């Protein structure tokens, strides 16, 4: 629950890794390549660089290294060899990391090629929609109202939020209390204080909420064929704000988020 600075200072070193994959990959993120490949490469790197593991292999079976996720995926896409990146596509690449114990959870939208209408509108919003939500996290405040300003934002564009997945508690264990919903609950109830750890990690879908698993059980669509984008950061709590541990160079919200003067 409370980690200790010696924690956070692993955390950030964690965090720092799972970024750095994401900037990594960013120039392979084109039309012809394989998201089996972009898999390998991620791996590879993971491994060979950055002496350290990807926490999706073996996860509850899960047969890849990170996600990729493509269009009207929602989540949990399985990098295929014969899988081909298409001009237009709007594609989530979801990393997790495991350096010296701890974890760093993070995934961002790319946009291959010529973006359309939907992709660019649908992926700004996203990203905007955990915008939002990092700069209220301070100790005091309640997940539910942070929940509660996501669904508020993403509804107002006229898009919905995905009901089953959520953030989480994050350190030793890839997902560990509190479960962060990105949505209006009753059962929220979360006081934020200084040195909790957790992501969040919105999926939103440009048209209805409902989601349906393939026949692999694995790879999640919009039941609607809807597009869907997520992004992900790993936070810190800290005692006036936040900070974001899974921030790369081509974020543009500041690391130290403080709401003190
Ligand atoms: C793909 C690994 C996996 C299996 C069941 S849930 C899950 C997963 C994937 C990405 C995440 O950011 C996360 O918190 C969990
Ligand atoms: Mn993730
Ligand atoms: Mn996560």
Redesign the pocket.
């Known amino acids: 629950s409370i980690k200790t600075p010696e924690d956070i200072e692993k955390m950030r070193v964690a965090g720092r890794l799972a970024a750095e994959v994401l900037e990594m990959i960013e120039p392979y993120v084109k039309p012809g390549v394989s998201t089996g490949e972009l898999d390998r490469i991620c791996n590879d790197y993971i491994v060979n660089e950055q002496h350290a593991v990807s926490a999706?292999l073996g996860?509850?079976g899960?047969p890849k290294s990170v996600?990729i996720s493509i269009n009207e995926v929602v989540?949990?896409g399985i990098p295929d060899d014969a899988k081909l990146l298409k001009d237009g596509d709007i594609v989530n690449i979801?990393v997790?990391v495991i350096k010296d114990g701890f974890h760093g959870?993070t995934?961002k939208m790319f946009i291959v090629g010529k973006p359309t209408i939907m992709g660019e509108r649908l992926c700004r919003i996203t990203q905007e929609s955990l915008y939002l939500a990092l700069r209220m996290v301070k100790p005091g405040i309640n997940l539910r109202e942070i929940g509660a300003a996501i669904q508020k934002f993403v509804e107002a564009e006229g898009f919905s939020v995905v009901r089953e997945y959520c953030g989480?508690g994050i350190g030793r264990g890839?997902?560990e209390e509190p479960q962060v919903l990105h949505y209006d609950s009753r059962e929220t109830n979360v006081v934020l204080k200084p040195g909790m750890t957790f992501?969040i990690?919105p999926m939103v879908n440009a048209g209805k909420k409902e989601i349906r698993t393939m026949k692999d059980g694995w790879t999640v669509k919009t039941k609607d064929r809807s597009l869907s984008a997520q992004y992900?950061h790993t936070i810190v709590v800290t005692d006036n704000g936040c900070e974001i541990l899974t921030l790369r160079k081509d974020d543009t919200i500041p690391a130290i988020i403080s709401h003190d003067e």
């Open positions: 999706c996860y509850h899960y996600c989540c949990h979801d997790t959870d995934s989480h890839f997902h992501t990690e992900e």
